[PDB]
Design a protein around this ligand. Structure first.
Ligand SMILES: [Br-]
Ligand SMILES: [Br-]
Ligand SMILES: [Br-]
Ligand SMILES: [Br-]
Ligand SMILES: [Br-]
Ligand SMILES: [Br-]
Ligand SMILES: [Mn+2]
Ligand SMILES: [Mn+2]
Ligand SMILES: [Mn+2]
Ligand SMILES: [Mn+2]
Lengths: 396, 400
């Protein structure tokens, strides 16, 4: 009834596969003879898909730029055409000048349209290659079976919408775990938020587009999924199924585990202990931590509120603050105003390693902190900064 | 005919006034003494107004930021209220949480409104101070008279919409010269364009707002004029009267004078000789430089075409190119595509100082180049980069 936590994913489905193999959660079926050959198949699929998404991102950028060029040229042509139409009978040099001024704009517009068509054809070429990639991924997934079912898997965040190749692979792996009754919890993260932002727009009839605070290269794995949806390689029905059953139910603002005499607090970013009380304040949850069980119950109630916001497609209401200058170093006022932003964006440093930030004993119970990768290394023996593919076990 | 040229004005009416005194174009009337005390009164007005426009720029920026806060908060509130429907379907617990979310946004909206109102109050206080300043300027303009009417005045550009206090002062001084039959030519410039862009919009009933490529601090003197217009201290009718009679007719793409054996080319930016044919190509002007007279006639035709664009409120058609990355360092392609932008934005540097860029003799005639101040110093004796320290008169033998 223990758990293993993974703090280093960055939207990279190979890293999830690596973690699941190395901790004996999954294994190849008996029929597979060559482990390294079978595993290298996914590495190759993943790399080829990564290259296709890179190609897509460059096409996306060029298409956006060319559409600005086309719209500008069209507006300028229309303006000159109105001036010519409104001309007086004594404006022959005026009309002659404007007629010849319009020609280079028309030529630029034709060149931009031709360029746009070529980029659309390149995108069409990508679409013809995408099914082959997915079919090879599907064949790989049929070679896998569950091994250990008794261990809770915890992902500390940035599992989607990050620097890897494709959130579809990751969602499919989460759904494989769901179909095999594996207990899994995922901490809400700053990259996870970009994904959820896009998904809850999609299901209300807005574009499946991220918030866009994080740049496209740093949410590449979202674009790897969106490419499949926009090119009709996967159905919106399947995306909704994966997200609704295998992803959203796992999400926690904060997770915990209880020992005989202590609590362990799992967060995405490194966080002060008192940020939990601030999160309770924003969400209308009564905060109590007099005992480890009371703090556990407080956190349960925070996570129930998260599920209410997500079920209503309104998580974005808790993640909007246009006055924060640096979400990795939020001021006292900013932390109080937007505690969930702090919980997913904070980065530790020496000035934050102070007395009372993260006590190791509190109200007579021990407190252990486990969070996702962060550059700063705290010397506190009860702070675990998971910047490795190796999992952290919870003990007896 | 002789001329004087000013290459460093930067929207500063004091610099213009000093230039006109220094070269004996104007003088105080004999009833004024002491002369120093009268000039110093205009200096005080100008500096007083300069500080006022600085205050105005600070208010403008703060108001623009506050309007962003206000609009953001209003959208979020309206968003939440729309989600607060309906009460019935036991979203009650959830209604409560959304109501609590709304409270800090409403508090931030109210705070931003109070700040906006106090800034609009500050602007109102500024407004009450403006009339006296214009009154003192008007008194000063009654104290001067024309002196030399036989010298052509050439402004090499950035005469308006630049770093000084107020384009109204400058336009009134231009009108004074116009009223006294002074010949004036002004070279079209990058700050000049910001002014004209706004003025052309005003003429056709659009807001008196600049293109906005140049930052507000660097077009301060436009804002000092716009402050008078928007606060109803001067009329739209007066402003247009001044611009139509005393400013727009003087404008040139490039100007020239002819000597017995050469041509002198006056520009705002330092420019390559081959920029002239590029300007001709965009304007549909037949280009001919086989003789200095043919080149002079080409430039005359460029300037006639400029006046068509000016008269029809459409100069913006020649100054729009969203593809240029650095207007001060345009590529060959960019120069061919937008030659007038090149003519007003180019900044020279060592890489541009090459043998055929600006030849001193061409097709049998000498070529001399005169342009507004530019930091790079070319060691060509026939290139005149008119920092304020350089002599302003035309060289011997040039006939303007
Ligand atoms: Br006309
Ligand atoms: Br889509
Ligand atoms: Br902190
Ligand atoms: Br001077
Ligand atoms: Br106005
Ligand atoms: Br050049
Ligand atoms: Mn993160
Ligand atoms: Mn480590
Ligand atoms: Mn200068
Ligand atoms: Mn300039």
């Amino acid at each position: 009834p223990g758990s293993i936590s993974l703090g280093d994913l960055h939207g990279n489905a190979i890293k999830l596969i690596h973690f699941l193999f190395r901790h004996k959660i999954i294994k190849f079926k008996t029929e597979i003879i060559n482990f390294h050959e079978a595993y290298q198949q996914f590495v190759t699929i993943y790399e080829q898909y990564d290259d296709m998404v890179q190609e897509y991102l460059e096409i996306r950028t060029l298409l956006q730029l060319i559409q600005i060029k086309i719209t500008n040229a069209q507006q300028r042509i229309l303006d000159i055409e109105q001036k010519l139409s409104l001309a007086t009978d004594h404006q022959k040099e005026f009309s002659q000048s404007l007629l010849q001024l319009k020609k280079p704009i028309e030529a630029n517009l034709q060149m931009a349209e031709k360029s746009k068509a070529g980029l659309e054809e390149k995108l069409s070429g990508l679409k013809t290659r995408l099914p082959s990639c997915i079919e090879r991924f599907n064949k790989f997934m049929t070679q896998i079976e569950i091994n250990d079912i008794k261990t809770l898997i915890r992902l500390l965040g940035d599992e989607v919408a990050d620097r890897g190749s494709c959130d579809y692979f990751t969602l499919r792996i989460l759904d494989f775990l769901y179909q095999n009754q594996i207990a899994i919890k995922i901490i809400l993260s700053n990259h996870g938020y970009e994904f959820i932002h896009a998904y809850e727009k999609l299901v209300v009839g807005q574009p499946f587009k991220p918030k866009g605070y994080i740049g496209d290269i740093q949410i590449k794995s979202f674009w790897g999924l969106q490419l499949l949806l926009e090119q009709s390689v996967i159905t919106e029905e399947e995306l909704r199924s994966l997200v609704e059953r295998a992803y959203k139910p796992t999400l926690k603002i904060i997770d915990y585990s209880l020992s005989e005499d202590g609590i362990t607090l799992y967060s995405h970013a490194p966080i002060r202990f008192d940020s939990i009380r601030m999160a309770a304040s924003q969400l209308g949850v009564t905060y109590n931590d007099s005992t480890k069980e009371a703090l556990a119950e407080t956190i349960d109630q925070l996570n129930a509120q998260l599920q209410i916001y997500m079920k209503n497609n309104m998580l974005h209401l808790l993640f909007e603050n246009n006055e924060i200058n640096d979400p990795t170093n939020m001021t006292d006022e900013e932390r109080n105003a937007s505690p969930l932003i702090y919980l997913v964006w904070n980065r530790w440093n020496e000035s934050k390693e102070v007395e009372n930030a993260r006590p190791g004993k509190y109200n007579g119970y021990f407190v252990t902190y486990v969070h996702g990768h962060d550059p700063f290394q705290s010397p506190l023996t009860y702070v675990y900064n998971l910047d490795t593919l190796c999992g952290k076990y919870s003990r007896v």
